[PDB]
Design a binder for this molecule. Structure first.
Ligand code: EB7
Length: 133
């Protein structure tokens, strides 16, 4: 038989939602600080770039990524969520940050460059989190 299964092809999943009209939302000073100070300083860092958008498993050649990571998260998604006032409190936003870092440590091993980048950002994240209102 001549069907060699060259199609159907692989793909990336739909990225996480940055809007939800029915979701409860607020603008708190902690959430404003998370956008104004915490997100924007992590975003400017030289190790930020791999975390600034959802993982493209096809482009980056990580076809096992969404087999292992079932709750993906990135700083681009958190930035859009903060800009759209998507969160109810700081805990929801901080949990997204925690998910992003945890995904990186689950998927990769100690010593990998991406983990060294994640640890540096987490170190810096936790310092900025200590100065929350
Ligand atoms: C945090 C998202 N992320 C990963 O977990 C991950 C593992 C392996 C490669 C890449 C990746 N590919 S990449 O841009 O070529 C890259 C970035 C930093 C690095 F140290 C190594 C690679 Cl291969 C982008 C985003 C992620 C990964």
């Amino acid at each position: 038989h001549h069907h060699h299964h060259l199609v159907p092809r692989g793909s990336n999943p739909p990225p996480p939602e940055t809007s939800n009209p029915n979701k409860p939302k607020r603008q708190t000073n902690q959430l404003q600080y998370l956008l104004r100070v915490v997100l924007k300083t992590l975003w400017k860092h030289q190790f930020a770039w791999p975390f600034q958008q959802p993982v493209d498993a096809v482009k980056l050649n990580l076809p096992d990524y969404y087999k292992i990571i079932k709750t993906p998260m990135d700083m681009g998604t958190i930035k859009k969520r903060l800009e759209n006032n998507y969160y109810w409190n700081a805990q929801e936003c901080i949990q997204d940050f925690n998910t992003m870092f945890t995904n990186c440590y689950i998927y990769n091993k100690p010593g990998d460059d991406i983990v060294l980048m994640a640890e540096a950002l987490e170190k810096l994240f936790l310092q900025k989190i200590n100065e929350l209102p």
